[PDB]
Amino acid sequence: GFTWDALDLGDRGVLKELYTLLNENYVEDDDNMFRFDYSPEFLLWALRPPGWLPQWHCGVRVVSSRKLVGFISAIPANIHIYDTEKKMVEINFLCVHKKLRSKRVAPVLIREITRRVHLEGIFQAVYTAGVVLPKPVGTCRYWHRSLNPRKLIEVKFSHLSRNMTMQRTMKLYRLPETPKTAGLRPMETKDIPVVHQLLTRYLKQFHLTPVMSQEEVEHWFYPQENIIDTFVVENANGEVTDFLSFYTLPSTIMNHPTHKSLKAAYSFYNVHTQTPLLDLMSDALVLAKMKGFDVFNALDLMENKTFLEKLKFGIGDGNLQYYLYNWKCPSMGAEKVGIVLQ
């Protein structure tokens, strides 16, 4: 029969077949043809934060042996909803093999990690999903800004309006070869606590935010070449600053001429002191582009809805929604959502 359990993370041989799963499984595509291709390392950046536990990377193999067919993460967090900071967890990566003809899988594959967590007291859960669910807390929507238009037009991810030449479109979505912000410089190792304290007071204005430690803001922020970026803005002789961050997350491709995948550039967080971030967000586009990216995808967060539309952002394939498992409380607009849980 089946009432299985497992584990997965760290080891090369394992981890690989693991992303193999999500590679051609964890989909959220539509008419077109493409799902989130997951990087070997990236996973570790997300699946291994400070305080993670082995029994939360559940696995599932076919009655046989050499057959992984299911997964689900659950990285430890410390949400902030009501007038309180409830230590909760962020559940993610819930997949099920493709050809699997069993609907009595996830319904157990789900309640399993629920028990596994309810053992450390973390009875509260946090996550988002490319689907609908009864009691939602939020409902954001993705945007863009082609850093390689002729490509999207070439494939089928994006297209030119009515009579828009495959040339003017470019001119429009053009970009300078050098930032228009003086001080923009990659975050050093010693810039960690400066990104912790600077982000804890800032983020400290949203109804739902991920409180982090000097080590956490040290994990989802310190630069890594093919995972996540973060350029701080040091001042003159001092240190005072603001900064931007965008975790790479390329999506697999499909039927195309001879084009490569799709180097994605989703946005993580962005904290400008007082100075308007309408440029802190633009530079990002100049970075993601100068770094060889095809698009900068930014969701909602208060101050996002601002610079968004007043900048080359529009198309919205769909919309991501936020939820809370065992907590009851009122809802808010995108302007209040802080947690950028992938």
Swiss-Prot record:
Keywords: Acyltransferase, Cytoplasm, Membrane, Phosphoprotein, Transferase. GO terms for biological process: in utero embryonic development; ketone metabolic process; N-terminal peptidyl-glycine N-myristoylation; positive regulation of establishment of protein localization to mitochondrion; protein localization to membrane; regulation of opsin-mediated signaling pathway. Changing Y26P: Abolished glycine- and lysine-myristoyltransferase activities. The chain holds residues 155 to 496 of 496 of the full protein. It comes from Homo sapiens (Human). One of its GO terms (cellular component) is cytoplasm. The gene is NMT1. Tetradecanoyl-CoA binds at F93, L94, C95, V96, S102, R104, V105, A106. This is Glycylpeptide N-tetradecanoyltransferase 1. Adds a myristoyl group to the N-terminal glycine residue of certain cellular and viral proteins. Also able to mediate N-terminal lysine myristoylation of proteins: catalyzes myristoylation of ARF6 on both 'Gly-2' and 'Lys-3'. Lysine myristoylation is required to maintain ARF6 on membranes during the GTPase cycle. It is an enzyme of class 2 (transferase). Changing Y38A: Reduced glycine N-myristoyltransferase activity. One of its GO terms (molecular function) is glycylpeptide N-tetradecanoyltransferase activity. Heart, gut, kidney, liver and placenta. It is found in: Cytoplasm; Cytoplasm, Cytosol; Membrane. Coiled coil: none annotated. It is a peripheral membrane protein.
